[PDB]
Symmetry: D2
Subunit: 347 residues, 4 copies
Amino acid sequence: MRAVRLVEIGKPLSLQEIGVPKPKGPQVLIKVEAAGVCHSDVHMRQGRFGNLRIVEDLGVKLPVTLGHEIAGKIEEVGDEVVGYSKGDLVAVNPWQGEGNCYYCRIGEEHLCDSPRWLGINFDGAYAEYVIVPHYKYMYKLRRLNAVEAAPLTCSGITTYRAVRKASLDPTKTLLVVGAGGGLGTMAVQIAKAVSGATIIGVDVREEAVEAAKRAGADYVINASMQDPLAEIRRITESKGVDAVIDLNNSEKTLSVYPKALAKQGKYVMVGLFGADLHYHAPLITLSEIQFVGSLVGNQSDFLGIMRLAEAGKVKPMITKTMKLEEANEAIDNLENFKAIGRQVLIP
Amino acid sequence: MRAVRLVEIGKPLSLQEIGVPKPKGPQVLIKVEAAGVCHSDVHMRQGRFGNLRIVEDLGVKLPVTLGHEIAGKIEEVGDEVVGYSKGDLVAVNPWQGEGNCYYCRIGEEHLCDSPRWLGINFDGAYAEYVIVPHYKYMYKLRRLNAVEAAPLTCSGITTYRAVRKASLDPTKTLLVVGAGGGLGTMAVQIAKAVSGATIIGVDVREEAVEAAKRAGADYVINASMQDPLAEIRRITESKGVDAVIDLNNSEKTLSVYPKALAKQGKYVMVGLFGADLHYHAPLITLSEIQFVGSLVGNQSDFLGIMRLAEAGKVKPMITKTMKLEEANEAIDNLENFKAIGRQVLIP
Amino acid sequence: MRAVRLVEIGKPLSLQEIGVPKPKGPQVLIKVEAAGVCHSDVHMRQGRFGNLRIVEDLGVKLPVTLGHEIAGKIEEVGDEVVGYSKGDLVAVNPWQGEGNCYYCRIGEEHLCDSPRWLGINFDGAYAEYVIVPHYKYMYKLRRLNAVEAAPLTCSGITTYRAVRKASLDPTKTLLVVGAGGGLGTMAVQIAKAVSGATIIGVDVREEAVEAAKRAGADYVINASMQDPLAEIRRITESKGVDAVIDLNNSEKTLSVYPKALAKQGKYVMVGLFGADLHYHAPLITLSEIQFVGSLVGNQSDFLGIMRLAEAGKVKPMITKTMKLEEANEAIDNLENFKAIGRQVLIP
Amino acid sequence: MRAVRLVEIGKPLSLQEIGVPKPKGPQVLIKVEAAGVCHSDVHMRQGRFGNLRIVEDLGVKLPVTLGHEIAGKIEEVGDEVVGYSKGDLVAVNPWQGEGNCYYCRIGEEHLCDSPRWLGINFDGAYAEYVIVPHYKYMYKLRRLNAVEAAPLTCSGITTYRAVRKASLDPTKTLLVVGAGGGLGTMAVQIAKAVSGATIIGVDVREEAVEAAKRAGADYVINASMQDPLAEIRRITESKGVDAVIDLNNSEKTLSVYPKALAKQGKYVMVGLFGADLHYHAPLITLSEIQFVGSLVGNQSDFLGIMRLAEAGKVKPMITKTMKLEEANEAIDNLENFKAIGRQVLIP
Ligand SMILES: [Zn+2]
Ligand SMILES: [Zn+2]
Ligand SMILES: [Zn+2]
Ligand SMILES: [Zn+2]
Ligand SMILES: [Zn+2]
Ligand SMILES: [Zn+2]
Ligand SMILES: [Zn+2]
Ligand SMILES: [Zn+2]
């Protein structure tokens, strides 16, 4: 079968012809119908996930097939698979754990000490077929097709968990930084569908500010034309927001938005490539604010985003379909910031 | 009556002879039997609480009587007081709110937008009598005497809340920084009485390391004679601790202990005078750690520490009693780090 | 001023001409613009709240002015009122506590040991003016008028809290019993605005089933034309629902709906006049289900429903306005089940 | 190997000579060093778990080897086992799930839709060796020996979870019914080690009342010599207790103890063989009490009880060791209420 893989850090991804794996036990072989491509793949091409080296830190022995945003049809099942049949269309949760470590035992499998992350340190969906280590990491698709579901396994689950980490309720206000981008509009949609909180979206280009409003933001701010902090203080009557979801954590956002927090406010950091946070510790104590990290999501987060999406309560991302052979090009587009919409490869 | 007050920032506290207030409505007049003195008073003498100026930022019109650690006997009650009688011995919660703002409505009265903090921006216990704005902020003492109870209204409630913010359970491990000091041993005692968590205490002098062990720490580390990070990694089998209660937040502690955190670990900051936190944002995201502030406590925190102390489940601080006239001297002792034990003034 | 009051249990409510109270301290005098009338008043006329006798059990000394659903304009304020002015239009939270008891200290003021419930054991809004014991129990109205806001102080807060007690999230399904009635459609609206959960509504008349659907239910069941349990098992794929909000707790509902619960399901009981629950204890243990009571709401619940309503996130109840003199008639209508929509008196 | 099994409901357990299983994949073969026997086995001999028939309702095809309280040494491991070696002494969590259903995905594996309960519907420890389906369900023993650890996998985990369901904190009081029995003293010990709550223990014989006190109860009541309700009202100053852990749920306990609950009190039911609960629904609503079931425990509960026990924070049950051949006799002892201490079989 065809597979686009990282063969050498410093070279582009390479198309190889390799054998189709045979699933055993609880494994499932999926015939890929959609392989999402996101900014994380710009770094995977460089052999990094966050600051982590996939070879040195995650134990990867190259080559590895990329593609952590997976949906497709069941091709074959191992003899211990229960509850699924050949032909079923499913989305896959790639953030898998092994079961024995502390994090797995308490239900936070994505923080597993020996992770099994498909498309990151295990072979992924940039191929005609892909092995899912255990059938429990799937979700049958009824309303969505593969292209609509694939991006949700990464962007959907990530923002779903970040909204949960924001600990919202109707008495509160949420600020989403970069609310008009793909990730930002997904966060706005989820917050509007699940919390009852007042949602403020901020961005810097007019199109983006409009997309945030289309996504459901109650208030939107164009940081290029208005002082964001002053607008936030006006909207919240000087209280500040009870949570910020910062999808960037750049020198730029970290130097402004933490100032928008209300007492006990939660600053949820979702970016994997940003700056250092510099903040006066005594002010964190006096205001009881919290700086909290959020990474992808666990099985419960996966079930939640899939259930929302399958019920039509949040809408799929804007996508552009491409061929498996254009994988390098898709990643190039993200590097050069020329990508419009979420790119999805169709093998 | 006699009252020691801040009359001019830059001068020592001044003893004045002023009228005894007459309580009305829900107010209670207390005849002071114990007025605790803590490091916060070294700053109050300078007109500051944390980085806040009590005049500019809190609205104080000097002079103001200090003393936020209060216990004594009820002298007189206003006509709306219910459930207490003249002669009752009580401890007082000084971190009072007004009721209408967001924080009061959700039960976090200490974060009130227009706080009524006795001994800080309202007259306190460095006097023969003190007015308690509402009787609901008291707790009748049965087992403890005033001197034993007074420090708990500040140090006890502060560490009780910090232990709550650490979100401990038996599957977890807590690290208390500065575990041998007065605040540190109180935190160790509370954690041992209320969480079931494994408790690691760290300090830098041999006496302190021993006091932490007496307080109940399961493991204690002398940071002067051992590498604290290596010991923590050994004790936790490389996982790191699920929470750190840092009672200092100095350049010193902030540069070491956040490294001891396990994934999803909570770094609880309780210090009001420290440095800046500098931490790589992407590492907060990848590990899902949290930096969280904790300040004094709310009514529920007050009820909890008082209930634990009145049941003998935690022990009173080591104290040294002094006269109301020695207030300046007591504060001098804390400035010069010559104070042994918690100083308590007896009018 | 005119006031309609309970003067003798066994007689209809009596119109009296009494003095206008003068507010002092934190009290506020409100000029009533809307006084909601609900089924609770059918029982108040009989001197009962639930099975409680307001005289014997709550300490009421007759006569008492009814009306616990209050909105109006500030007429006068006591000298300690802050943050409100004469002329402000506000809704009032009538479920007030005194501050000192356990329940008040932990922020559950409605469960106060010595409650101050306006319209129940304290004079209410069936009069030209009404005293609010403390200004913190109000909410300024901007988007809603008094008639739209008044019912929310009882029906809105009650269902808002019941939805919270149901502990919903997007992975779950909620069943609302009696989903087409005034209370039922309010519960459906709140659940749809704040949880992300799949919502099933059940009722027994065609109009009601339609109103539940208009309210936002994802699935609605006509219990008269379909087997509710079989439909629930079909919709939930045999799992059952994760929560039921039972607004009646009649012999009828209690004998059917607890059977619809999934393992760990929460059966939230909101009715004040129902039957006995009879359930095999071993089945509660084996399935980990929970039977949980929910009564009116606390300050946080009041803030939440008011914020949702003021943001247009839930819609006001269908109302019918009437004169203060028609109070007895309004209650008669509820007794005879002839009331259409929520009746609101306008003094 | 020797194995004592249920071969026919209506006959005593039968000793058979069967093959030793060979573990594959993540399975582990354990050489049994301790097989606890509890009241649940009196019912297993009758083919029942609670009211469930293990054949009709759980799908068991007889014969099945009993023994759900397991500790022993690793004999052999399948090729996917990581983190354990031959010879390691471990306790096993028998309440296993399959991974795909709702309950498994949210971390409540014991409520799995297709449970794998060792000693109940899967072969257990009443044999020389036993297969553990996945290595993640074990805990290495360092401080405890097999006989001390085995009972904890059932009684320890059950009471640990019930204490968690009681939602205790230092501001609250817990009542443990039957506090002097094996299960009762374990509940008292756990509550004392993990909550900070005031603990009241009640029982009916003098020895039992004393054992409850030895276990750590702050207050103990002899229901045979004192009115339990009056004593509870005295101790709690008329408030009632915030939680009751009822280990029986008999007509007897259910008719008395729910009356001891304070408003918002949680009545935690742990018994598998009791009566029907009959309670006036309007009183549940008015007081916001909760009746909540608790069954065995999940992976997080297992980790917690094992960590407490391995740290010496709770003590092992009083045990009496016996031979595998005396299994029927051990169960007879429990039937005739002649068993003193927890019986543990040693193959
Ligand atoms: Zn992605
Ligand atoms: Zn793991
Ligand atoms: Zn202090
Ligand atoms: Zn306030
Ligand atoms: Zn009402
Ligand atoms: Zn109260
Ligand atoms: Zn057992
Ligand atoms: Zn399962």
